[PDB]
């Protein structure tokens, strides 16, 4: 089974233009995330599933913050740690999203720990401005920084 999630730009003032979609499919080796995105800054970007199915801004962190409404990283086991797709932390930690020099992301990625679409229903798929070193050191949540794009999983 699979599901298509449309992604949009987010700012501290709301949700912007659509930048494509990501389709998620259940495979023998876990959930596969096959992006078809454009208009993204080239480089590697933090890619995680957040706890709430909302991309709206919220005023937490000395002001308004883009898609802050989605809460933290999905973690139903309350591990409290950020360790990556192959770690034992947040269940929502996905391998990083690599954007090419044309500003597109088209390479599929796998999360072996996720096994069913049922597990991520009504959650938010997020893309960060910063990367992800899959650790809380030396920067929290892998140095992801601000939220750049977001989509809600129906
Ligand atoms: Cu995130
Ligand atoms: Zn995390």
Curated annotation (Swiss-Prot):
The lineage of its organism: Bacteria, Pseudomonadati, Pseudomonadota, Gammaproteobacteria, Enterobacterales. Belongs to the Cu-Zn superoxide dismutase family. Zn(2+) binds at residues 73, 82, 90, 93. Keywords: Antioxidant, Copper, Disulfide bond, Metal-binding, Oxidoreductase, Periplasm, Signal, Zinc. It holds the Pfam family Sod_Cu. Residues 53-94 are annotated as: Disordered. The keyword Transmembrane helix does not apply. Its cofactor is Cu cation; Zn(2+). GO terms for molecular function: copper ion binding; superoxide dismutase activity. It is an enzyme of class 1 (oxidoreductase). InterPro entries: SOD-like_Cu/Zn_dom_sf (IPR036423), SOD_Cu/Zn_/chaperone (IPR024134), SOD_Cu/Zn_BS (IPR018152), SOD_Cu_Zn_dom (IPR001424). Disulfide bonds join 55-150. Its EC number is 1.15.1.1. GO terms for cellular component: periplasmic space. This is Superoxide dismutase [Cu-Zn]. Binds 1 copper ion per subunit. Binds 1 zinc ion per subunit. It catalyses: 2 superoxide + 2 H(+) = H2O2 + O2. It is found in: Periplasm. Monomer. CDD domains: Cu-Zn_Superoxide_Dismutase (cd00305). It comes from the Bacteria. Cu cation binds at residues 48, 50, 73, 128. It comes from Escherichia coli O157:H7. Destroys radicals which are normally produced within the cells and which are toxic to biological systems.
């Amino acid at each position: 089974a699979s599901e298509k999630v449309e992604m949009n730009l987010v700012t501290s003032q709301g949700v912007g233009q659509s930048i494509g979609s990501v389709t998620i499919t259940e495979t023998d080796k876990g959930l596969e995330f096959s992006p078809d995105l454009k208009a993204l800054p080239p480089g590697e970007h933090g890619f995680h599933i957040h706890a709430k199915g909302s991309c709206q801004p919220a005023t937490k962190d000395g002001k308004a913050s883009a898609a802050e409404s989605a809460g933290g990283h999905l973690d139903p086991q309350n591990t409290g740690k950020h360790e990556g797709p192959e770690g034992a932390g947040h269940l929502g930690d996905l391998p990083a999203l690599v954007v090419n020099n044309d500003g597109k992301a088209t390479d599929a990625v796998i999360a072996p720990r996720l096994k069913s679409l049922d597990e991520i229903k009504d959650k938010a798929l997020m893309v960060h401005v910063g990367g992800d070193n899959m650790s809380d050191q030396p920067k929290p949540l892998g140095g992801g920084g601000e939220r750049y794009a977001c989509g809600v999983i129906k």
